């Protein structure tokens, strides 16, 4: 799995394929506990370590009804060089897998300013490893409504909005 990470981490954009959706959703019905873990990924070179988890069958207020998406800060080798708490804006997306030439795909996208007072968005070392995000990201009804599920697979995107710092032209 160190290669899945090497292939992701660098520029704050994870794209995560979750395969065997139908099976995985059936097990999440049998174990409500069951969560999928993305590869860890870094917001920039020597940046924050982040991970994404998905509950195909929902968690908290969306248990049973929704796909639930969370993002989390992990202990990073470079934590002692970064500002805390984590405060970059995160943008979750579930990708509609329709050809973008043949039809501008309708993606489900949400953006949130992290909660400064969440035990996890502060520097690892302070006293939870839980996560933050959307328990009602998309409905079991709506997830089937387009190409969000194509080829028994789903695509979750997490983008750390870090804009370009340039001088005036």
């Amino acid at each position: 799995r160190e290669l899945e990470e090497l292939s992701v981490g660098s520029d704050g954009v994870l794209i995560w394929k979750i395969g065997s959706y139908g099976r995985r959703l059936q097990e999440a019905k049998a174990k409500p506990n069951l969560e999928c873990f993305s590869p860890a990924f870094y917001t920039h070179k020597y940046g924050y370590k982040l991970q994404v988890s998905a509950f195909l069958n929902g968690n908290g207020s969306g248990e049973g009804t929704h796909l639930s998406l969370y993002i989390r800060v992990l202990p990073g080798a470079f934590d002692n060089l970064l500002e805390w708490p984590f405060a970059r804006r995160v943008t979750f997306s579930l990708l509609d897998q329709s050809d973008p030439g043949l039809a501008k795909p309708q993606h489900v996208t949400e953006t949130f300013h992290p909660d400064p007072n969440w035990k996890n968005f502060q520097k690892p070392g302070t006293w939870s490893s839980l996560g933050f995000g959307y328990p009602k990201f998309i409905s079991h009804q709506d997830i089937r409504k387009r190409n969000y599920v194509r080829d028994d697979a789903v695509f979750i995107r997490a983008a750390v909005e870090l804009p370009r710092l340039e001088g005036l032209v």
Partner: peptide, 10 residues
């Protein structure tokens, strides 16, 4: 069922 959920926004 039950859950130790992680925090959220609407």
């Amino acid at each position: 069922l039950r859950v130790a959920p992680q925090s959220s926004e609407f």
